[PDB]
Amino acid sequence: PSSREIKRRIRSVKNVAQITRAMEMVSASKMRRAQRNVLATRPYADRMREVMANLTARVVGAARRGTLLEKRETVKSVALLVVTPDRGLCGSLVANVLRRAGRFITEQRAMGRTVDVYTFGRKGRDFFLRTGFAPAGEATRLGDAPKLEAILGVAISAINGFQSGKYDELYIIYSEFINTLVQRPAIKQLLPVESPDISTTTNVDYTYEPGEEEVLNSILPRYVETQIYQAVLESIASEHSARMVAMRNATNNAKDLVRDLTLSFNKARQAAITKEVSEIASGAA
């Protein structure tokens, strides 16, 4: 409060506001491109979805569905895929998601199920490497636009797990995107039971060339990989939107702080001028 240190504070907060404004612009742009990527990815997932509907409308045999489509009765071991933004400043999303991981790891741990975790992101990799839940699988350095090839490194293992019996289910905790301002966390089941309303499939019939069993066994891993990829893309879009909102709020707060510091600096400036003229007049008199 010496009319010069306040100037330094004003300059620092103005720099903060400028950096935050730039980050908000680029987060908005990257959120737009992530939304475009999700829209581009939609047709593949949709097509394979009605393919799931039609095929599951058939091959209903439990022994036939013993491959992945089977529902483990014991559910002794479960796995959670958590996709967490890699860099912070995201706002409350990183935490909101790592909390639902807890509500789940507990409600499940409470079922006596041994909950394990495959994490997409460094933010998640840590919350759990610290908590002690070393991620059974960690995919870090995730770009705004990754390729399905990436989630494969972890999804292959989670799936090889629901096949090795090592697991009896796979849920993914990812950050949904409801409104450009809202980004509720959400959980989805990764077990490929499918079987929607017979109305959805319309019972389209095909002559499966390699065989119904072979087609199902080769298509279920691809379906769960596509689900993981869609969840990761939605998580990236929600991350960018949350960062944009957080930087907008931070820029507004920085502008308010700049206004308050400007008022304080002007008060200090007037006080300094008054003191200077008072002492000069005293010395003259």
């Binding site: 950096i19 980050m23 581009a40 097509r47 394979m48 499966y208 691809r222």
Partner: protein, 130 residues
């Protein structure tokens, strides 16, 4: 005259209408005509061929699936490549992918964003006297 769609987990490759599809089905190569019976096949690493008014486009596919309705064909292929282009590398598709993409699309993005975060953190330490 059948509504062919080479879709991929990343993007849609083609959505046009095609005369013939020389699909590499796992059991054996299968040709498809505008009124083919309903079908669902698994592909193997090969070179799918699209016959369009007498023009053969050899889209290499390292794997994927195929659903053939009587009216439309969908190829849920894992990866679709066009070695026929050859210049695709020199072309921005790969040439820009090398510089216009990753180099600035990602590396420059990461550098700039990290630098912004660093300047923010340093100045927020510097403002820790308010």
């Amino acid at each position: 005259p059948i509504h062919l769609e080479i879709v991929t987990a990343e993007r849609v490759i083609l959505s046009d209408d095609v005369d013939m599809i020389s699909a590499p089905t796992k059991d054996g190569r299968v040709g498809i005509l505008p009124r083919h019976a309903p079908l669902m096949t698994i592909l193997e690493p090969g070179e799918l061929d699209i016959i369009k008014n007498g023009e053969r486009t050899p889209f290499a596919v390292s794997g994927g699936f195929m659903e053939v309705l009587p009216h439309r064909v969908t190829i849920l292929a894992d990866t679709v490549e066009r070695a026929d282009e050859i210049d695709e590398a020199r072309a921005e598709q790969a040439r820009a992918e090398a510089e216009a993409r990753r180099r600035e699309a990602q590396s420059e993005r990461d550098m700039a964003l990290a630098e912004a975060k660093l300047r923010k953190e340093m100045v927020r330490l510097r403002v820790a006297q308010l």
